[PDB]
Amino acid sequence: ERPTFYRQELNKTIWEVPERYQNLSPVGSGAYGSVCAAFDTKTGHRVAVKKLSRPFQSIIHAKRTYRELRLLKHMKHENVIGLLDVFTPARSLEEFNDVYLVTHLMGADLNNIVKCQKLTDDHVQFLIYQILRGLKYIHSADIIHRDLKPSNLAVNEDCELKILDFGLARATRWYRAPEIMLNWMHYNQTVDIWSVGCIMAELLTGRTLFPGTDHIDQLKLILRLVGTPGAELLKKISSESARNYIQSLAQMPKMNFANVFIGANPLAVDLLEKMLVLDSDKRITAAQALAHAYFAQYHDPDDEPVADPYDQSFESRDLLIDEWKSLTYDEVISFVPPPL
Ligand SMILES: Cc1ccccc1-n1cc(C(=O)NCc2ncc(C(=O)N[C@@H](CCC3CCCCC3)C(N)=O)s2)cn1
């Protein structure tokens, strides 16, 4: 039942796509990759079409291609980007050299909702609720985002939010957890919870919480708010050199957040305290945060679903370039679209 394709020049390359997709036009000025908006003649809705770059040039390109298709095929949740379609003009494995991914077309990213102005407390509740609902789902599959920031979060006009990643699945360091920038090495899923705390502060105040000029300055701004490590945290660091280094960027106590977020909802301030903890073993989880009193008007414990298990064992394998290309071809052929 193979569709009829048509060719055109877009982004100075030949795009070849099913006649299903009409009125292609480049969007994002390069910020999303090679992406066009299009009209889906099957549904009457607009979609985003991404063309992958040199997908089987090398073992590293081939494994990156496979990884992104496996992640997108897994994600089935309202608050996470999903795969509407995946296609290739190739009629066989022999001629397989191009991959196209189709998602929802979003309206605006969170920088374009905030625009350096405060949001209302009710609007902040609704946005952060949806990010946490998405993160409960991703974390339940043992997937960590690792680069959450306003540019990777997007809404429609009804303010319905989805999580995406415009980088390489694993630019600015303003949203990065302190353990990552201190090279502490034993990361857990609450690196994403740190990023959510920074984003929530920014929605409430209209300003960046930790706008560091450089790597050193980023850590000094963090430690001025959250303080020098306590005795319980220092006991979990191996190297004398690492313990000296963190203490040399601090020598200062944790501030009370009630003194920093003047005018804010006291439940907002309590939740920010539980997200922005230096010791990642003591940081609140996505599931715990959804039950916090700050989200009473939105929380439904019966509609905060978890993921099917995600087999990540390919990440440990060393395969030949034609093997990664064949595994990718099989995943295109096996795709089942979501319901109309
Ligand atoms: C028009 C607009 C306006 C304002 C903001 C955003 C948008 N906008 C851009 C797209 C888009 O590029 N869609 C095509 C895509 N293919 C692939 C995508 C993607 O997110 N891969 C991830 C997938 C895996 C992650 C895993 C963590 C959770 C999020 C998905 C990756 N880098 O491998 S997104 C849709 N809407």
DSSP letter string, 16-62: EEETTEEEEEE-STTBTBSEEEEEETTTTEEEEEEEPSSTTSSHHHH
* Rounded Cα gap, residues 61 and 52, in angstroms: 10
Residues identified as active-site: 165
DSSP annotation of 120 reads P
User: What values do phi and psi take at 6, rounded to 5?
Assistant: -135, 150
Query: Which atom in ligand 1 lies closest to the alpha carbon of residue 32?
Result: 12
Interacting residues of 8 by C-beta distance below 8 A, sequence separation 6+: 14, 15, 24
| 42 touches 20 (CB < 8 A) | yes
Question: DSSP secondary-structure letter at 257?
Answer: G
**Candidates 64, 78, 81, 166: which one to mutate for ligand 1, based on the most atoms within 8 Å of Cβ?**
81
Atom of ligand 1 nearest to the CA of 101: 16
| Residue from 113, 98, 109 nearest 49 by CA | 98
- Ligand 1 centroid to Cα of residue 264, in Å, is 32
Task: Tell me how crowded residue 27 is: count the other CB atoms within 10 A of its CB.
Answer: 16
- Is 260 annotated to bind ligand? no
102 SS3 class: strand
Please identify which residue in the block is written with the tokens 């625009």.
Answer: 115
Q: Which CATH number goes with the domain that contains 277?
A: 1.10.510.10
Buried b (16+ CB within 10 A) or exposed e, 201-220: bbbbbeebbbebeeeeebbe
Resolution in A: 1.6
Q: What is the β-pairing status of strands 45-51 and 85-87?
A: unpaired
At position 218, the amino acid (one-letter code) is: Q
Mapping DSSP onto H, E and C, the string for the chain reads: CCCCEEEEEECCEEEEEECCEEEEEECCCCECECEEEEEECCCCEEEEEEECCCCCCCHHHHHHHHHHHHHHHHCCCCCECCCCEEECCCCCCCCCCCCEEEEECCCEEHHHHHCCCCCCHHHHHHHHHHHHHHHHHHHHCCCCCCCCCHHHEEECCCCCEEECCCCCCCCCCCCCCHHHHCCCCCCCCHHHHHHHHHHHHHHHHCCCCCCCCCHHHHHHHHHHHHCCCCHHHHCCCCCHHHHHHHHHHCCCCCCCHHHCCCCCCHHHHHHHHHHCCCCCCCCCCHHHHHCCHHHCCCCCCCCCCCCCCCCCHHHHCCCCHHHHHHHHHHHHHHCCCCCC
* C-beta atoms surrounding 158 within 10 Å: 6
> Which of 244, 243, 286, 289 shows the shortest CA–CA distance to 268?
289
Q: How far is the C-alpha of 86 from the C-alpha of 66, rounded, in Å?
A: 12
**Strand 108-109 to strand 35-40: parallel, antiparallel, or no bridges (unpaired)?**
unpaired
Query: HSE of 32 in the Cβ direction (CA atoms, 13 Å)?
Result: 23
Say how many Å lie between the CA of residue 168 and the centre of ligand 1. Answer: 11
Experimental method: X-ray
Q: Is 35 annotated as a binding residue?
A: yes
Alpha-carbon distance of 210 to 207, in angstroms, equals: 9
Does 191 show up as a binding residue in the annotation? Answer: no
Query: What are 169's two structure tokens?
Result: 């699945």
For CA atoms 254, 153, 265, 207, the dihedral sign is positive
Ligand 1 first shell, C-beta below 6 A: 27, 32, 35, 48, 50, 68, 71-72, 80-81, 101, 103, 105-106, 108-109, 138, 145, 154, 163-165, 169
Indicate the SS3 state at residue 173: coil
Which of 62, 199, 191 is closest to 119 using CA atoms?
199
Taking the CB of residue 237, how many other CB atoms lie within 10 A of it? Answer: 15
For 180, the domain range is 108-295
- Answer yes or no: are the C-beta atoms of 174 and 208 closer than 8 Å: yes
CB neighbourhood size of 125 (10 A): 23
CB atoms within 10 A of CB 286: 22
CA of 61 to the centre of ligand 1 (A): 18
- Report the side by side order of strands in the sheet with 35-40: 21-26, 35-40, 45-51, 100-104, 85-87
Gyration radius (Cα) of the chain, Å: 22
